[PDB]
Amino acid sequence: GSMLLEEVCVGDRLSGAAARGDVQEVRRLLHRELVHPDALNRFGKTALQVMMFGSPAVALELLKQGASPNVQDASGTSPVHDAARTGFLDTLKVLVEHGADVNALDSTGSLPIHLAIREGHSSVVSFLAPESDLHHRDASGLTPLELARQRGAQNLMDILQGHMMIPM
């Protein structure tokens, strides 16, 4: 016959729940529903890929199971990429710090930090600064410090400048 193997019913399950931002569902989900971390929606995205970096505990819940945060789709945009430009330094750092691929890029070659710089989240930008490739630069020719000089939302280039390194 055709279509005899289906493993999506559980996909979007935890995927739509964790992304919808519901620490209550994400909690009882694994603690009860034992939902899988690789759960993929109809399309084919992981929970972390859809996650709304809303509830901090929700992030740890997903990663607590066994999901691969190193996922990219359409313009190579992983959880870190969205969490940055979106504005969720809360759950962002949780996963970002844990391991979340916060170094990759979105095809063009812009580090998740660059986006935060053009945003002006203040915390996110300065945060994603040291939590990224403190050296790489966009195809344009700007780095964490340079981009900070552009979108001078405030003491941007200052935060990244200090955390940068400068051992002299």
Side-chain angles (χ1 to χ4, degrees), residues 86-108:
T86 56
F88 290 117
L89 183 76
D90 318 294
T91 316
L92 180 152
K93 85 216 296 184
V94 117
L95 51 104
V96 160
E97 301 278 65
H98 226 144
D101 198 310
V102 61
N103 335 82
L105 316 163
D106 52 277
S107 239
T108 81

Side-chain angles (χ1 to χ4, degrees), residues 14-31:
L14 154 75
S15 130
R20 82 121 134 207
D22 216 284
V23 75
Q24 296 163 271
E25 305 329 312
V26 168
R27 265 256 184 174
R28 278 113 202 159
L29 256 162
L30 300 158
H31 278 312

Side-chain angles (χ1 to χ4, degrees), residues 108-110 114 136-143 146-147 150:
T108 81
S110 218
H114 287 180
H136 182 80
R137 5 166 258 188
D138 209 89
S140 243
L142 326 118
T143 99
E146 203 78 7
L147 216 64
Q150 162 76 252

Side-chain angles (χ1 to χ4, degrees), residues 27-72:
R27 265 256 184 174
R28 278 113 202 159
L29 256 162
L30 300 158
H31 278 312
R32 324 213 116 177
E33 194 33 282
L34 262 182
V35 64
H36 237 234
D38 37 76
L40 292 127
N41 45 326
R42 163 60 142 172
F43 191 9
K45 314 156 101 171
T46 81
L48 242 60
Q49 202 151 74
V50 282
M51 234 227 311
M52 67 166 233
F53 287 55
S55 306
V58 153
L60 176 58
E61 285 338 286
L62 265 162
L63 298 124
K64 167 124 169 115
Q65 244 321 279
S68 235
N70 285 254
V71 301
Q72 333 155 275

Side-chain angles (χ1 to χ4, degrees), residues 105-160:
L105 316 163
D106 52 277
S107 239
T108 81
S110 218
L111 297 145
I113 178 209
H114 287 180
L115 331 193
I117 296 172
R118 48 177 208 167
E119 236 263 33
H121 268 307
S122 187
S123 350
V124 163
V125 198
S126 43
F127 173 97
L128 244 116
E131 292 318 291
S132 221
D133 196 322
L134 286 86
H135 184 207
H136 182 80
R137 5 166 258 188
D138 209 89
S140 243
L142 326 118
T143 99
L145 238 184
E146 203 78 7
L147 216 64
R149 169 158 121 163
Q150 162 76 252
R151 268 89 224 207
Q154 69 299 314
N155 266 224
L156 259 198
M157 89 183 313
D158 183 59
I159 319 132
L160 306 84

